[PDB]
């Protein structure tokens, strides 16, 4: 007639990327990044076109977009109301990921090179963490973007004040505090393609604070690292077999050598050894045909092989490898495999982090550093209390300490004034207070709309 399931003893207490992103399609997720492309990682230069309308030198008219944006938004609302009115999934094509439609915001990063960073086509959510005031509270200050959640336990290193709403980017890669600023009055956004220039205005720009990593970047040549390498190659080989039109399905080796040119061909052969065979003569000659007994994996199995966040962690590792290699142990500590391991270990409670150090991406007192630290009388007798109490009121010591009239305490205090066991609680308290202070300082520096002199 009741619950009768002892649930408190058995059980004591989401991000959907675009279909180009979960299928690891090669413009958005590159197979190989060279040295000059690893130095320009997430900073892609403005390339000159060889063919197209912008390839011809001269003045080029920009095309302001207003009819395209509202036509696409009205069309997507018609699609959503035709499908029952609920929430829909729209990003199914690469042409859905253009900047020419939808409500764009901008997101600026505080650090130069973050430990993790999203590729093009990946999704993120905006969560507004709101700690209620003690007792009565009016309700979360409402915000234009994101959903609100009431956080008793602070997600970040510091703890939220009562009545403080903090927005944050939340995805599988990291979680980072964001701060909404209005755009400058002079800046517009020009989307250039091969055909022409297009212009939008922007009104909302977020500043993203120091990231709290939720995914561990592997080290160079680590087991996980090289496992992702051979998995990325296997997924690319399977998707080339799916794209093949001949029956039985056949691929060419130098397509894979064009995609992965740093790979030795022994490793590519190793991936093709199972699931394919080389025909040297007759029909299908110089092709790697698919074995007739081999069942090519379905789309969901290929998606379950490699995740996009693993590709972002691998790209962070190889970009940091390049930056360290170019710059000839302090720098090695600031490498994202070390800092991600340190932060995730600190979140399980394995170890603590020195919040002031050299892994600090600011280079000043603002921001944290994610590197691991371990969790860990002859003349004072003549006074004989009577005269020590008189010495305390002559030393301007407050009357409480004089009042307790203790022996050891009063003398320890008068030795301290004449100068003027455990290691677990005090150290933990100091680390927590330092982290909270750093978080508060970072928020104050970030949300400031005060003008800063050049």
């Amino acid at each position: 007639p009741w619950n009768l399931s002892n649930d408190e003893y058995y059980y004591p207490k989401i991000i959907q990327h675009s279909i180009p992103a979960v299928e690891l399609r090669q413009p958005f997720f590159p197979t190989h990044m060279g040295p000059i492309k690893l130095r320009q990682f997430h900073r892609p230069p403005l390339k000159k076109y060889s063919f197209g309308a912008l390839s011809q030198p001269g003045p080029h008219s920009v095309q302001p977009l207003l009819k395209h944006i509202k036509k696409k938004a009205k069309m997507r609302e018609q699609e959503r109301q035709a499908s029952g009115g609920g929430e829909m999934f729209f990003m199914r094509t690469p042409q859905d990921l253009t900047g020419k439609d939808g409500d764009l915001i901008l997101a600026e990063y505080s650090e130069e090179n973050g430990p993790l960073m999203m590729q093009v086509g990946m999704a993120t959510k905006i969560k507004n963490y709101y700690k209620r005031k003690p007792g009565k509270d009016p309700g979360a200050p409402d915000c234009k973007y994101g959903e609100t959640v009431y956080c008793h336990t602070s997600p970040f290193l510091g703890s939220l004040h009562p009545g403080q709403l903090l927005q944050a980017f939340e995805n599988n890669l990291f979680r980072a505090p964001i701060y909404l600023h209005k755009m400058p009055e002079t800046d517009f956004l020009i989307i250039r393609t091969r055909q022409g220039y297009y212009i939008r205005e922007l009104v909302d720009i977020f500043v993203v604070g120091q990231q709290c990593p939720l995914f561990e970047v592997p080290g160079p040549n680590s087991k996980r690292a090289n496992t992702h390498i051979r998995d990325f190659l296997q997924v690319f080989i399977y998707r080339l077999f799916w794209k093949s039109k001949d029956r039985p399905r056949r691929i060419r080796m130098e397509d894979i050598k064009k995609a992965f040119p740093s790979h030795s061909e022994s490793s590519i052969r190793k991936r093709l050894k199972l699931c394919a065979d080389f025909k040297r003569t007759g029909m299908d000659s110089n092709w790697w045909v698919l074995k007739s007994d081999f069942r090519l994996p379905t789309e969901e199995e290929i998606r379950a092989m490699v995740s996009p966040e693993q590709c972002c962690a691998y790209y962070s590792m190889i970009a940091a490898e390049q930056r360290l290699k170019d710059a000839g142990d302090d720098e090695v500590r600031t490498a994202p495999w070390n800092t991600t391991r340190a932060f995730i270990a600190a979140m399980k409670g394995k170890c603590l982090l020195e919040v002031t150090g050299v892994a600090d991406p600011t280079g000043c007192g603002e921001g944290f550093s994610y590197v691991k630290i371990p969790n860990k009388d002859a003349d004072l007798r003549r006074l004989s209390l009577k005269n020590a109490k008189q010495l305390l009121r002559k030393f301007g010591v407050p009357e409480e300490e004089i009042k307790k009239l203790s022996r050891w305490e009063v003398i320890d205090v008068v030795r301290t004034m004449s100068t003027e066991r455990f290691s677990v609680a005090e150290h933990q308290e100091r680390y927590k207070e330092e982290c909270q202070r750093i978080f508060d300082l970072q928020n104050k520096v970030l949300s400031s709309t005060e003008v800063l002199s050049t």
Binding site: P1, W2, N3, L4, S5, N6, D7, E8, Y9, Y10, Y11, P12, K13, Q16, I19, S83, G84, G85, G86, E87, M88, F89, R92, R295, T298, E300, E301, A304
Partner: protein
């Protein structure tokens, strides 16, 4: 897209019923249909009608000619000498397909008059006025007329529409398909002291000019099918719901307080089903009618539900609250997704049954807890795998035979066996749970809300089905709405578990490689059994090692056998630290039984029941004991109880005893540990040290501290130690000694539990606890040592059985003067007398059970007595008792009792096809063939039960015991 199989579209139907005569069991009425022809040259119009005498038919007030023929009255000819069942199944499928309104066909063929052909070619309206009469209906609509004198309201006489699926043809002529939606106008002229309950909202109630009768006018503006239209006419006590005011509850007279207490929960069921879906309840009223001699325990129509009165309990009745509560809940789930959103074909029925069962399981999860949800899901999955390995398999969504491994045709609902229908609904809701596992629960509720929102925008238009077919769901439309809301399509999961009809069998065994620190699993499938299929997807496995609980996904391709997964450290055995569990907590474990070299404590293959599977894993006995003790999953505790019966070591006895002593364990795990402890105790006789099992534990938990053999006075307010207290002597009575005689220490304990029972102090009744005490007394009966077939007299009465017989005589006689609830003690005492007769104690005489199986008794007493008579005619090979049972199948007033007799005679058959019996005449073959052909022609559930009985007794070929 829905295109009609009928060449006309029905817009509106008026059903008027006059002259409901209860003495003569007769109704008179008319029916006026408003059809729009879609094809010119319509000529004949084919409607559905059974048992109605059609007087006249006028089309547009012009007299028309009709011809009636029902091929399902006598399926095969009387003078055909065929006696095999495949012939009857094909002929019965062809006969049901010849009256099918889902094709163009129908039983009543009306010819359009000639002068209306210029009205039908340019497609204009036709108004068909049939007037009919039911003279004395067999199974059309049930007349319950008691034999007390007085007026018909003073004796308690009532009518209700019974049947399943498309059975509205049995009481008025209609287009009896779920795809012909129309609006309705329903008038019923009943007696002045009676009330007529039906679908729609009651617009008025006018008197007749003599003021002796009154007419109830109902109107249904939401377009429903004819199959969802119902009727209940009787002297009902009306009760408006004090929480929701459009909901009226009708009961039989003198049962108003039971109705008040029983239907007081229903507003919470309404609130749940309207907050997980975001649509409000689509109909403008809701009516719950409680009746006598019901067809099914719960039937759901449009804006109406018909329950039996046997669900009505008072405030002091426990063990019946949860069952009645979930009957109300599944009636409301079928109100949402069987009556508002209807079916497009007979295929796509799995969609509606799955959505109904799935949202009812979500209700059960919120109401009774996740643990009760997991236990229910596991019992449904065990039910399906038992049925599919027993006979063939259940095929959701067949394509039109698609399933030729069974003995009936799955093209129509009225040819299905009843066990197949039950397993169909069961498999449909488990496959919907699988679709929720692939595509998350919030997207699933968004799918259901999109279907309901399309239906409710469709439900308000007036266009005659330009838009009313958005209220009909199909499989392709359901998968398209899933693909719209999620972007993933489930076509491999649909192809495996819907279109393919099989379950999978997993045989697992592990080996721990100490050198490389890996766990080598070995999972092989039995795919050559008749019910099985081959699984090639991914498979989750959960390994509990000393460092915690880790999940692994295994890819089980056809050629796969060995799966090497990695193992973690064993540094929580170096220091004593707590071992972290599946949830966030951690416990102290006694690691003395564990191996020194392996860190892993237990392994579970497919823990979340994400496939339709039967797992046979080979762990070590200490791993089963650790999984019984420290797991935070009830299905794993249940499967460890089930696997500890093969290991009778004293460590397993200690494990089950620690489970039994432990509150904060789920109570249905302790109730299983009682029976497991009884089996283990029976297997380690001549090793057992102290008292019998669970006795000291019973005296520690439920008896007085100062008196060990006196039980505490009954206080049943905890509801978990009540269930454990009433289940522990029932398992304790299975204690088997070396001599095979129950220990007179346990029988004396049960008799002292019976004597010292005092129930004058709790707020709850004692009928189920006393009934379980009689069941415990019946469990202790071992077979008697008859010498030279000595006639069972008082001279050879066992000294043990005389006490048992005195107690059940006292209990049955006291039930004759003071009854309980459900006549539980009558049912338990009849069951115990049959237990004593099955052994050589009481003379094998069926006259007592034949007197309790008469018509005037309660239906639980009747089915218990008929179960005893079926068991007697199986053991004693009685010819006259089998003729008694077949006669009772042919002419009994209650059709539920006839269905139950056929069901019990199928489950416990008097002979199988392998047996040579004296009861295998040509006379019995001719009787059962006449019962399949004629005789059961009025119910559609007795005919499938007769087909099941003929299959169980004589098989699919020609009866062998024949010239």
């Amino acid at each position: 897209g829905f295109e009609s199989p009928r060449p006309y579209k029905l817009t509106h139907q008026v059903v008027c019923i006059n002259n409901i005569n209860f003495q003569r069991k007769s109704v008179v009425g008319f029916v006026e249909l408003t059809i729009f022809p879609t094809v010119a040259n319509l000529n004949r119009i084919k409607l559905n009608s059974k048992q109605c005498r059609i007087y006249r038919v006028r089309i547009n007030d012009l007299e028309a000619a009709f011809i009636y023929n029902d091929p399902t009255l006598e399926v095969c000819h009387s003078e055909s000498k065929q006696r095999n069942l495949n012939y009857f199944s094909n002929a019965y499928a062809a006969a049901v397909s010849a009256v099918d309104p889902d094709a163009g066909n129908g039983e009543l063929c009306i010819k359009v008059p000639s002068e209306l052909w210029k009205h039908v070619d340019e497609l204009k309206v036709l108004k068909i006025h049939i007037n009919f009469s039911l003279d004395q209906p067999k199974g059309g609509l049930h007349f319950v007329v008691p034999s007390v004198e007085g007026s018909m309201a003073e004796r308690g006489a009532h009518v209700f529409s019974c049947g399943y699926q498309n059975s509205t043809r049995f009481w008025f002529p209609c287009v009896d398909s779920y795809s012909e939606l129309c609006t309705w106008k329903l008038e019923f002229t009943v007696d002045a002291a009676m009330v007529a309950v039906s679908n729609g909202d009651l617009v008025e109630t006018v008197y007749t000019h003599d003021m002796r009768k009154k007419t109830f006018h109902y109107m249904l503006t939401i377009p429903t099918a004819a199959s969802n239209i119902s009727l209940a006419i009787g002297p009902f006590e009306i009760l408006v719901d004090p929480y929701m005011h459009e909901v009226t509850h009708f009961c039989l007279p003198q049962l108003l307080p039971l109705l008040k207490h029983t239907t007081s929960y229903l507003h919470e069921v309404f609130e749940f089903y309207e907050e997980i879906l975001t649509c409000r309840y689509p109909y403008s009223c809701f009516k719950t009618v409680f009746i006598d001699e019901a067809y099914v325990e719960v039937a759901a129509y449009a804006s109406m539900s018909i329950f039996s009165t046997n669900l009505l309990h008072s405030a002091m009745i426990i063990d019946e609250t949860p069952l009645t509560r979930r009957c109300l809940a599944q009636s409301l789930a079928q109100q949402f997704f069987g009556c508002f959103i209807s079916r497009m074909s007979w295929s796509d029925e799995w969609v509606l049954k799955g959505i109904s069962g799935y949202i009812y399981g979500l209700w059960m999860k919120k109401t009774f807890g996740v643990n009760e949800y997991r236990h229910w899901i596991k019992e449904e999955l065990d039910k399906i795998v038992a049925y599919e390995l027993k006979t063939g398999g259940v095929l959701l969504h067949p394509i039109f035979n698609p399933a030729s491994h069974l003995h009936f045709s799955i093209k129509h609902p009225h040819t299905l066996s009843w066990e197949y229908y039950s397993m169909f609904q069961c498999k449909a809701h488990l496959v919907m749970r699988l679709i929720e596992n692939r595509i998350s629960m919030e997207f699933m509720l968004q799918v259901f809300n999109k279907l309901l929102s399309l239906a409710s925008t469709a439900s308000s238009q007036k266009f005659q089905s330009h838009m009313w077919s958005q209220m009909l769901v199909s499989t392709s439309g359901f998968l398209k709405s899933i693909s719209n809301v999620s972007g993933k399509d489930i076509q491999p999961l649909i192809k495996q578990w819907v279109d393919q009809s099989g379950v999978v069998k997993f045989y697992g065994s592990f080996a721990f490689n100490r050198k490389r620190n890996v766990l080598e699993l070995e999972i092989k499938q039995d795919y050559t059994s008749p019910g099985t299929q081959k699984y090639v997807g991914p498979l989750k496995v959960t390994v509990q090692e000393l460092d915690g609980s880790f999940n692994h996904t295994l890819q089980i391709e056809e050629n796969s056998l060995k799966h090497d997964i990695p193992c973690h450290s064993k540094s929580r055995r170096n220091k004593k630290k707590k071992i972290p569990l599946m949830n966030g907590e951690e416990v102290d474990m006694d690691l003395s039984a564990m191996d020194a070299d392996s860190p892993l404590l237990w392994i579970r293959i497919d823990p979340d029941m994400s496939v339709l599977r039967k797992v046979e894993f080979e762990q070590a006995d200490f791993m089963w004991q650790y999984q019984l003790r420290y797991e935070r999953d009830v299905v794993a505790q249940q499967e460890s109880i089930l696997a500890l019966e093969k290991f009778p070591t004293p460590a397993s006895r200690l494990a089950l005893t620690d489970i039994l002593e432990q509150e904060q364990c789920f109570y249905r795990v302790r109730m299983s540990a009682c029976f497991c402890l009884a089996k283990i105790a029976n297997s380690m006789v001549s090793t057992w040290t102290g008292p019998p099992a669970m006795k000291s534990l019973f005296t520690r938990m439920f008896c007085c501290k100062s008196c060990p053999n006196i039980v505490k006075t009954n206080n049943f307010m905890s509801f978990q130690s009540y269930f454990l207290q009433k289940t522990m002597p029932v398992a304790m009575a299975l204690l088997r000694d070396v001599h095979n005689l129950c220990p007179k220490e346990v029988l004396t304990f049960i008799l002292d539990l019976i004597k010292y029972n005092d129930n004058r102090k709790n707020k709850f009744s004692d009928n189920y606890y006393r009934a379980e005490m009689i069941d415990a007394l019946a469990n202790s009966v071992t077979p008697a040592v008859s010498v030279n077939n000595e006639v069972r007299t008082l001279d050879n009465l066992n000294p043990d059985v005389r006490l048992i017989l005195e107690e059940i005589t006292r209990f049955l006689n006291m039930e004759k003067l003071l009854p309980s609830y459900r006549h539980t003690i009558t049912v338990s005492c009849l069951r115990a007398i049959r237990v004593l007769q099955k052994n050589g104690h009481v003379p094998s005489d069926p006259a007592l059970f034949k007197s309790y199986a008469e018509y005037g008794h309660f239906v639980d007493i009747r089915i218990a007595a008929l179960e005893a008579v079926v068991d007697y005619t199986k053991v004693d090979r009685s010819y006259e008792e089998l003729q008694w049972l077949l006669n009772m199948i042919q002419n009994d007033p209650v059709p539920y009792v006839r269905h139950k007799i056929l069901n019990m005679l199928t489950k416990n058959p008097p002979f199988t096809k392998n047996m040579e019996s004296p009861l295998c005449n040509e006379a019995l073959v001719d009787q059962l063939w006449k019962l399949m052909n004629s005789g059961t022609s009025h119910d559609w559930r007795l005919r499938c039960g007769a087909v099941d009985l003929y299959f169980t007794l004589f098989g699919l070929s020609r009866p062998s015991c024949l010239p």
